[PDB]
Amino acid sequence: YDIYSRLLKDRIIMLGSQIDDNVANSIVSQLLFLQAQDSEKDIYLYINSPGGSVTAGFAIYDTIQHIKPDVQTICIGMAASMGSFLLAAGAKGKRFALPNAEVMIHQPQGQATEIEIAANHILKTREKLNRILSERTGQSIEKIQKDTDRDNFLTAEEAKEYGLIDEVMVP
Amino acid sequence: YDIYSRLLKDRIIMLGSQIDDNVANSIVSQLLFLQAQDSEKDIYLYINSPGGSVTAGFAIYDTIQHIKPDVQTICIGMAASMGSFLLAAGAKGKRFALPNAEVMIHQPQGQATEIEIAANHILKTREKLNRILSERTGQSIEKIQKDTDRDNFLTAEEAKEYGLIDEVMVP
Amino acid sequence: DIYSRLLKDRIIMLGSQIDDNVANSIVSQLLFLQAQDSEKDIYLYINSPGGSVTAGFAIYDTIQHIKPDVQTICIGMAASMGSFLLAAGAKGKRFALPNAEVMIHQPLAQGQATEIEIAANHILKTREKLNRILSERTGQSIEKIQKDTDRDNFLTAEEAKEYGLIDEVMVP
Amino acid sequence: DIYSRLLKDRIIMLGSQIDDNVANSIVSQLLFLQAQDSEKDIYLYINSPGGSVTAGFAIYDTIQHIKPDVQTICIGMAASMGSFLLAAGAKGKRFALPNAEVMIHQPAQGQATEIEIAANHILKTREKLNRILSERTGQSIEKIQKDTDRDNFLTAEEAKEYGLIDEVMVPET
Amino acid sequence: YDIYSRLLKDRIIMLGSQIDDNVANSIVSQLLFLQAQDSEKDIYLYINSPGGSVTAGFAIYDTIQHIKPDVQTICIGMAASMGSFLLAAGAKGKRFALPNAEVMIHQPGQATEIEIAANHILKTREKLNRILSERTGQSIEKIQKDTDRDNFLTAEEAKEYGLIDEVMVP
Amino acid sequence: YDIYSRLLKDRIIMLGSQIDDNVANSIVSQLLFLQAQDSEKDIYLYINSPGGSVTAGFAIYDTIQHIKPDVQTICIGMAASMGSFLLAAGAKGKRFALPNAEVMIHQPGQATEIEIAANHILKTREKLNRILSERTGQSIEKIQKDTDRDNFLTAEEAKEYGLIDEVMVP
Amino acid sequence: DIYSRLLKDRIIMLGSQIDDNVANSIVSQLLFLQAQDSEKDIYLYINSPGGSVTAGFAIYDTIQHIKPDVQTICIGMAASMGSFLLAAGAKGKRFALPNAEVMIHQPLGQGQATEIEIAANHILKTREKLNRILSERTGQSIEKIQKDTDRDNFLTAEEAKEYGLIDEVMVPE
Ligand SMILES: [Ca+2]
Secondary structure, eight states, rough: OOOOHHHHHTTEEEEEEBHHHHHHHHHHHHHHHHHHOSSSSSSEEEEEOBBBBBBHHHHHHHHHHHHHSSSSEEEEEEEEEEHHHHHHSSSSSEEETTOEEEEEOOOOOOOOOOOHHHHHHTTTTHHHHHHHHHHHOOOOOHHHHHHHHTTTTHHHHHHHHHHOOOOEOOO | OOHHHHHHTEEEEOSSSSHHHHHEEEEEHHHHHHHHSSSSSEEEEEEEEEOOOOHHHHHHHHHHHHHSSEEEEEEEEEETTTTHHHHHHOOTTTTEETTTTTEEEEOOOOOOOOHHHHHHHHHTTTHHHHHHHHHHHHHOOOHHHHHTTOOOEEEEHHHHHTTTSSOOOOO | OOHHHHHHTTTEEEEEEOOOOHHHHHHHHHHHHHHHHHOOOOOEEEEEEEBBOOOOOHHHHHHHHSSSSEEEEEEEEEHHHHHHHHHHHHHHEEEEOTTTTTEEEOOOOOOTTTTHHEEEEEHHHHHHHHHHHHHHHHHOHHHHHHHHTTOOOOOHHHHHHHHHHSSSEEEO | OHHHHHHHHTEEEEEEOOOOHHHHHHHHHHHHHHHOSSSSSSEEEEEEEOEEEEEEHHHHHHHHHHHSOOOEEEEEEEEEEHHHHHTSSSSTTTETTTTTTTOOOOOOTOOOOHHHHOOOOOOOHHHHHHHHHHHHHHHHHHHHHHHHHSSOEEEHHHHHTTOOOSSEEEOOO | TTTHHHHTTTTTTEEEBBBOOOHHHEEEEEEEEHHHHHHSEEEEEEEOHHHHHOOHHHHHHHHHHHHHOEEEEEEEEETTHHHHHHTSOOOOEEEETTTTTTEOOOOOOOOHHHHHHHHHHHHHHHHHHHHHHHHHHHOHHHHHHHHHHHOOOOOHHHHHOOOOOSSSOO | HHHHHHHHHEEEEEEOOOOHHHHHHHHHHHHHHHHHHHHOOEEEEEEEEBBBBBHHHHHHHHHHSSSOOOOOEEEEEEETTTHHHHHHHHHOOEEEOOTTTTEEEEOOOOOOOOHHHHHHTTTTHHHHHHHHHHHHOOHHHHHHHHHHHHOOEEEEHHHHHOOSSSSSSO | OHHHHHGGGGGEEEOOBHHHHHHHHHHHHOOOOOHHOOOOOOOEEEOOBBBBBHHHHHHHHHHHHHOOEEEEEEEEEEETHHHHHHHHOOOTTTETTTOOOOOOOOOOOSSSHHHHHHHHHHHHTHHHHHHHHHHHHTTTHHHHHHHHSSSOOEEEEHHHHHHTTTTOOOOOO
């Protein structure tokens, strides 16, 4: 679509699909582009994703944390698994959801190849997810481990109360 | 294509297919872009939709309510399921249909993934749909509960009488 | 390429089966042309076997809604919803080329219509509203239209003028 | 690409079977060119094995309706509807190159829709084709009836003497 | 591949595939475009073609002869059947091949049902031989024999035969 | 896509897939283009790759070493097989990984029969090992050992191993 | 989109099997750059496992024909027709990168060659002309080349220089 090109001028990135390497490459490239345009101005990352690959999600995570600009995260529909992980990873005080957004932190995948899955288990990237979520939500590692194994769906309000977002955007 | 892009210049968006995640993302992006262009001028959402997925439809709904410009809604052919919900969700006074439009309130999937179905069951989106509809139509939620469970087809004039739209546009 | 250039001349071509995509595109073009200039005429050329009635009504309603006069010109053919849109053009401004073939017969499902669309038509009785508009725009009685839209009667351009479906056959 | 640049030169290329898609494309180019300038000649090159008669009649009628003269020029082939459209050019301005192959035989051809085939027979389009061909070749309807019911191939010079075209374009120098 | 539109600015046309109706329509369109742009300047037609449809080849042949500009023909790799025919059809004195080009005048075709019927009733095989005779300076009798056999010709032998005017030497 | 052309203006090259011939040709072309634009300014090569073909990987490797501009390598996500080899081949002091990047040096990615035959005859594994040994500061004995096993490394471990120079801290 | 931009720098990339499509592309780019400037060098980068000899001879002939010098650089692999086009660069201007792989073997006859192409190869004895050309350009005896062309002969960049296939190995800096 020609629309996502216009939105880059507004420093808006839409993450509206399952997260695989292709998507990760696209989002990362968009993040580096906007940093090159203007290293100071905020970026707006709208999220409607059911999740996906963990190494691909970490690629985006790492790029959000590395670049100079504050990356604002705004969930518009769903944020599950890596979707919700990236939602929580946005700039402090600047993580949002619309009132009818659905958030799940269950971390179960996502067209991941042999090499990726091998890396995940060997470098125990799941423990790294749990540890990062714990830091960014304030929850204990033990509560994070428990909830990421479970299939709990949170309303926007329940997501704020959990510490995944900062503010529910009520009209 | 080039017509919708040039139509976007007039702050017109066309919602003319079933609503899935792709469509929602597109409509949401278009709404955010038009807000970014001018935060004050009306937006015209044209609707010819058999409906689609609830979580996709709520993403559009939330965006309409979130943005500063008021989104005028106009049914040209059909609004069924989520299509009619979106029609009823336009700026008050600014909801329209052409004389031979067909509106159906019945909410039944729109290629909704199993994660989305689970979320909607758990978060009780169906009761929420009924409630929002009753607020936007002026009907009691009991009337809404009944009418959304049967397949009730309404003319543009009947949908006006029902409160789904404000006016039938005059030839 | 050619169609975007024609759009500048306020010319819209309807040269396929009418389904929802086509209807959405035709509706869009009509809206764009009204936004471009509200006073100048639009030229809708029709070569269509017909299709979906709900899609056709979407185009019909838009033609009647928009400000500019919409001229309808049949090239090749106008069957079912195709003939309905041809008869729906501005009065005094509905045309057919000499060898055009017009058919009023409304089938008994077309335009690869969805389950939801078929149900709406039978419940809201669109077949009767079609027959009503046709009689109003041709000058024939409702019982004449009712019989003719049930039959597979093919009309020449001149017979279609006699019928009231068009205003004039265009002279070479 | 090349075809859009050619359209600036008021050149239209008809190089395939005739269906509704092609007919609509040709019809639109003719209307565009008339909208550009209504006095200057149009140059319609024809290399076509034929196709749908109702699609063919749409092009035919459009040629006769617009104000500019439509010169027709056969390169390669003009069979069935192709040769009918060749014969449909502005009289005096129908051409073929020396090695062009013309066929007048009229055979539902070329992915014609079910409604179209029925329309052909009911409105008796075959009689109209014959009568028009007769009118613009100068040949009698009886001769055209016989010649269109046989697989009848003609050279460019034979097609000229038959009256289908006005001149064979012999190359310089 | 947008290289071909760039070459068109330099009045260069590439015929580097099997000759069918689509290729014919394409080549004919470029030739007409190049005449419209400028009717005086030479056009350069490069050939690497195994041949193809006789009626499609004839459409190209006629357009070459009909347009005002001189069309140079340059064989770069192969010119077989209709390919070699179109090579022999260039402006006189301006038909070339590169030193390692392969040229075959044997005529066996990627035509259609209607096209095949036309070729045989109108006797296009005789028209090919006749034109080959006119443009090579060879007799109808020799050409008839050679177009029936699978004689491959070097670039030098094609010059000697009269299919080209000069071999293009490094 | 389309974003990648804009990134080229910033002298950024994304290597975010398996390395086959088409990918190598593309990366090599982007490197040559950027050198041609400016021979002095740094190039940034972002790597997210499972690796792939040895011949294709060496094509990129050689071009990185040949061109004038310093090529910075930045691992985002993963660098395995040729991916990690290309990561280790960045300009000295300008090889980086993000905190959560996964690095694997193990050498076993869609390559023709000719290429596989070439690899074993011309002893390309011995070449890889020697080059890795030269750019990490680890011995050939050590690198021969670690290339055989499926040892994954964190960004910090990759730095300690000598594959990268720094981890990029948020 | 880099290739079109790269073409502004007089750079051509041959990165696949050689067939008629590839050859017609390369030939076109060579002819384009001549028309652009006939004096400045052209840079042909080679990463090719070979292909059709007819297609390769088309490129070869065009390289020799045009005025600009064509520099050849092997980046990854040059096999069969790939090697041949490598050895065919301007004298003193044939290069390979240090880890390039070169094979002179000319296969059992490649690259989707048509029955017409294969017939011409055998009749016009195209293999003999290849061996003759390689001999002239490597400075080796036709006897040695005939032997090495019949074996699967993989060479390093340095060995290719010692053979005479290239003039220099491009040393990195
Ligand atoms: Ca720099």
